[PDB]
Amino acid sequence: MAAVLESLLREEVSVAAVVRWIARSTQGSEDNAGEAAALSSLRALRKEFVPFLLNFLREQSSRVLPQGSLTDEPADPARVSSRQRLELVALVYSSCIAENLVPNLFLELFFVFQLLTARRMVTLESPLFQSIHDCVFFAVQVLECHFQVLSNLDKGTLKLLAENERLLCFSPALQGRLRAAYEGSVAVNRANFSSDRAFHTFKKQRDVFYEVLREWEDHHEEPGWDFEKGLGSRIRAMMGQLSAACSHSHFVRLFQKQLLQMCQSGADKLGRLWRLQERLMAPQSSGGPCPPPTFPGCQGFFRDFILSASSFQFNQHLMDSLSLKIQELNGLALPQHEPNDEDGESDVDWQGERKQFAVVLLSLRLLAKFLGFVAFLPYRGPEPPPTGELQDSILALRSQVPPVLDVRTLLQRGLQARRAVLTVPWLVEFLSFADHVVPLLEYYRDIFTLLLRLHRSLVLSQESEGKMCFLNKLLLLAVLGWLFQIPTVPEDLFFLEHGLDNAPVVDQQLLYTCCPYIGELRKLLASWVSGSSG
Amino acid sequence: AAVLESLLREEVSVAAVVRWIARSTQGSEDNAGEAAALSSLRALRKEFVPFLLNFLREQSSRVLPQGKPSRRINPTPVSEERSLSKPKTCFTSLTDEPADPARVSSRQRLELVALVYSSCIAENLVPNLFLELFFVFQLLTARRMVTLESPLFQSIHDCVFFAVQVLECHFQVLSNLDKGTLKLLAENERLLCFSPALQGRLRAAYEGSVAVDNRANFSSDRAFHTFKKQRDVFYEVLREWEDHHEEPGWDFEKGLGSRIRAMMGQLSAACSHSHFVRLFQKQLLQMCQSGADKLGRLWRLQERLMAPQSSGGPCPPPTFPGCQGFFRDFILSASSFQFNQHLMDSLSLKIQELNGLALPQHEPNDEDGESDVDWQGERKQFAVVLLSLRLLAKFLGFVAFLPYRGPEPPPTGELQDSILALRSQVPPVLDVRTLLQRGLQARRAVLTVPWLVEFLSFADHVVPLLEYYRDIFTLLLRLHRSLVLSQESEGKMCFLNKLLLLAVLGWLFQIPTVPEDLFFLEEHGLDNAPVVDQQLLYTCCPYIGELRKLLASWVSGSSGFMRKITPTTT
Amino acid sequence: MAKVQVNNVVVLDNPSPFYNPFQFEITFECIEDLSEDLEWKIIYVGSAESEEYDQVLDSVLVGPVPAGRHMFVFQADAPNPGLIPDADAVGVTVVLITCTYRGQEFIRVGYYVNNEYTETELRENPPVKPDFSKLQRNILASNPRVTRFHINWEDN
Amino acid sequence: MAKVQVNNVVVLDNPSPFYNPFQFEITFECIEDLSEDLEWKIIYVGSAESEEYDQVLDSVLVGPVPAGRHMFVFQADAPNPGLIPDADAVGVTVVLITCTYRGQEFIRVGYYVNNEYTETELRENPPVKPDFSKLQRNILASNPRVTRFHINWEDN
Amino acid sequence: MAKVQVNNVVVLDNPSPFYNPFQFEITFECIEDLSEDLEWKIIYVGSAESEEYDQVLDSVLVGPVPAGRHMFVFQADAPNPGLIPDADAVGVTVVLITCTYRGQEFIRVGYYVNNEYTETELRENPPVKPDFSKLQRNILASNPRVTRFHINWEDN
């Protein structure tokens, strides 16, 4: 293992050969005899070279990155020691990232930015990072290869990258490219209710539900407001009164309708105020380009509601309604544009269709999320896999009840029909709320294997005249890497042995709404700038 | 009524019409006139049997009611300084007309109607055989009249004659009933008066019957301690119930709901629901499934105390008798999604495991009696298995459909497609259709059907409309129509197995949830062994005894305006 | 000093159609275990002019009677209509309870009963004949009269 | 949600001869108002062998029943000794107290009754033919065995 | 089941010049004991265009926190006017008060701050170059906008 790392560092075997060997690529006629023989001999050590490589960089980064009068010594590429080793390691890292060997592309990009944005050291044998010069050079060398991903990021993050001093110092060409980037980027009824007493009771319960929601809206941001003490008694009384007169179906329909209606949702002073208001609801800010699943904003309320309800009847009806709605939405035709002519008079049409799709997808995500929240609610808990053995009883017990939603069949049909962009994201949202014992059942094991195969088939460098647009690839790769980096999913799982998709349907706004952790990159730069002034 | 009247004229033979209703193939012996008439009336088919049954219900209305010193009072020592015991103010001729077959009017008409009724019941055209047998017994034990045009029941003589005529055909079913009911039929006076031969055969049958844990399983250590505490609490509440579940006024909710809910909460806290559900199911199976002359008499008395509800006829609604009741209440009082889901998973696992047991039965070789134990062993084994299965299935069907069950009959003819679409999505908790199909294919109906019926009896009013359960009910209907208690093909299914299956299926098809029109809608191995005995038949179907009660009732009432007491206020 | 001391006499089924047996739930206090047995007897005043028409409903005997706060419920039959003089019975009469200890009486209770008809016509045009088909007796006014007497509690 | 609930039942004077009438005090708590009259019954188990010898002592109708806690008594005539078989006369039997609404039963509070001989020579020498005049019936009121069923308490 | 919860926050010097230090009163209720030191921070958004101009006013390390309602003060120096751009100096901005535990943030009680000119001539004639000496900061304490996240409060 360490031996293979040293052999690569000595250049006996080319970096391309080892990366191809890790990727299980077919052995071509051009393969060299010595390199092929060495890699075949070490094949027994395959499947763990890459995680060890990541751990090695993480450990050596500890001295350059804190935790995991003083002047600021500017970083210059002249005072660089062992430049050859750093360049080789950066090239190998870039090859690994570009082949999707790593689980989360943006996690690796975040680490690269952290190396590029190191302030000062904190107090094979020789470490690979002797000074900020070495780490900055490594980061810039790796980032040089990855330009398309950066080019398609936000306009603001592009600007912060543009004004960075270290990038100019180490790679002026890259800066001229990302400058051109920022440049262009800125250039752009009585029948339903049985009997009549039931109808009246449903009217009262709907009134009470809207009353409690209005109370939440008025009071869900003031300090000290606890949802339980505030609303649990009322929600539980409503659940009881609704179960009494068997009216859970109508209330769940109203609940889902409102969920979709609400969650999915000087002039200069108003726009700046909107930006500030976005700042108020900004993500966790703590860090991590792969944050755990969470309910931001209005969605939070509903989660709390379900938790406070604690009702078998309401939970079952909600599960049924959400499954039905998700299946209905996933089957929408969503006729996308036909790329004919360059006429701009049809401008509106594009956006129309695009927006439609975005709406649909977002709704799906939301619904799926709540479904995955309630379906696995009884099983989720701080109980990691019991142990290596004695768990066959648990797997047998939990492998019987059929899944609430046939997610495997939906995923397979979507992949076969080339609707991955619409079918995968909400499946990932659904699975992110699993427990610690789901990534072991044959059903969900096959689901995860299929997701792994799909992710390995999504490389952000190829083009075959209309396979999959770049931004679609970015969205799917980001969501899949985020899925594969949740604590519930075992770390070893990844290391185990025409059509909507073809047309462009995800744009920057949709990408940043679906994945509100790309901004992390921007945040890092901003932090640096702030800490540059401080 | 026109077809009924035409049959009454003897234009078409009873056998011909009975075979025509069953959609039997037209043989070469079919008569031209009868075949033509039946083909013409085919438009009125599919409801002739229901119409005949209804006709008997209306015409039976006239036969049944409707659709010196003195004592000494040793005062009770119940001082109990309390309530009104407190101080206050300054206190400081109608004869029984015996039934005789001589006074019978339109004997031919009664005979034809009785023969048609017997043919219909014996061919399984009717949904529940024992419901019809109970009705026949009710006719047989009619006291007096209460104050096409001519009624078919002019006097108690006519109804008694009809009942005995119907019973004549059915002897095997009666012969295989309990000893007590056989005795009551044998000693019955009306049978001797109207049919000495049937009473003699039943007397012979009665005489013949008389001649017979660890730290590894529990993650962490807090979970282990809290699970021990909750097991102790569960056993405490169970003991409290056992001690106090029959004293008047003891309500389960007020008594135990707070404790059960607190247990539920702390157990959900440390994610230990699986182990508690294992304990719950183990206790359920262990408990619910479960001078010498003085002990036998005490057993008989104790059976009398816990006899099922007397109002319920031969098709009582599903219920939890005895210890089972507790557990139902428990499930109701917890009202926890987590516990309910874990219980459904555990019950599904146990049902799947039990239903697949091999249960190698005896090979019927030789007549040696030395192998007695072996017979007993295998039979008992099967019985145990079956009973356990039934119990588990019942509770599963109780909790799976709990969120949907309610006093909400089918919404209406239309506007319900939304409900069916909504309810056709979630897969069933247990793949009952596949299990039923595999059981029927493998010839294990006696073991696979009863627990399926227990599971389905707790369905909803919208379950018989789903495609899945609609197909399940269609398959059960075909199976029930395939169980005729007169045929034999050298080893298809022993008689008592047929009786048990037919009784359970008829009871299922006479539950309010199942639509009445569903049954009348358009159409080696564990089985085939003497695995079901009288004890098992009466344990699986504790409503056959209804027949016995009826007879007993009559006898008692042979020996025997109420009052208007007004309740005292607070 | 008396060993017996009634403490109430609940009337059961106060509004009752005719022919319904009289019901009385008595609760009485015993302080010492008297050897003999008490004798509770219930009287319906058939007519208001003389006692020859009085009909003894029934006379139960009670014992043994240990010390404590004991009670019972007594059910007497309906009055015999054969000896009824005339409609005077329909007038408010009295039903009384007397208990004879040592064979001597020491208490009476007055419960004037409004023997009232059922049909409205029967009140507007009541028949001269004392028709017993419809009537409402046993309606007790709930008046606890106590005619205590100094009965001799001889040891023998 | 049973419209009618039941609470402690006290059988009055459980120690009595075989001819003494039964006496029960039942305190049934009704939640809201009923539209008809409860039907209470006594079933005396003449023989444990079968129901063939069950004796319906007396059926009473109780109403009207507006909301509130109510109680009453159910005096019924003693069982006819003629019907009771020979062997089962001296043994222990059961008496069932049932209630029904719209011909539907919802409570069957039972009772284990015992039948001894008071005088010692009869127990020492049990006569072949039971003589009902000298038997003592004791109702074990301390261990009632109730059973409850669920019925529809609808308006019609 | 977070060990630390937060309640009403009272900003005292809500009316102040642009150079006056901030002053907040946070009433955080801790349920059980913590194993480390709570870390509070204030982030002043210098410009609404981007985070590039965010100013970390001061980070405090406060953890003497037995269960109970607690208090402290979070005075921090005013933001340096040099870094804040020109356009965003005169407009309305927001100040975020964040808290972290084990380097992990779990509450972001915010505040809408406004920056006017006191003198009437300044509002009438807004100078091209902002003069922070005469700028007035008003913090809208009546409409706090808090957001809460769930974290693992484990031992280690």
Residue numbers in the entry:
A (entry chain B): 1 to 68, 285 to 339, 355 to 419, 439 to 515, 535 to 766, 782 to 818
B (entry chain A): 2 to 68, 192 to 216, 285 to 339, 355 to 419, 438 to 515, 535 to 767, 782 to 818, 823 to 832
C (entry chain D), D (entry chain C), E (entry chain E): 1 to 156
Sentences from the study reporting this entry:
CDAN1 interacts with CDIN1 and the paralogous histone H3-H4 chaperones ASF1A (Anti-Silencing Function 1 A) and ASF1B. We find that CDAN1 dimerizes and assembles into cytosolic complexes with CDIN1 and multiple copies of ASF1A/B. One CDAN1 can engage two ASF1 through two B-domains commonly found in ASF1 binding partners and two helices that mimic histone H3 binding.
To understand the interactions that mediate CDAN1 dimerization and ASF1A association, we determined single-particle cryo-EM structures of the C:C:A complex. The asymmetry is explained by the association of two ASF1A molecules with one CDAN1 monomer and a single ASF1A with the other. In addition, this stoichiometry matches our SEC-MALS measurements supporting the predominant presence of three ASF1A in both the C:A and C:C:A complexes. In our cryo-EM maps, the two ASF1A molecules on one side of the complex appear to stack on top of each other on a platform formed primarily by the MIF4G2 domain of CDAN1. We refer to the ASF1A proximal to the CDAN1 core as ASF1A-1 and the distal ASF1A as ASF1A-2. This showed that MIF4G2, including a conserved central extension (residues 645–675), mediates dimerization. In this placement, BDA1 makes canonical interactions with ASF1A-1, where the consecutive basic residues R825 and K826 interact with D58 and D37 of ASF1A-1, respectively. We assigned the previously identified B-domain sequence as BDA2 that interacts canonically with ASF1A-2, where the consecutive basic residues R195 and R196 interact with D58 and D37 of ASF1A-2, respectively.
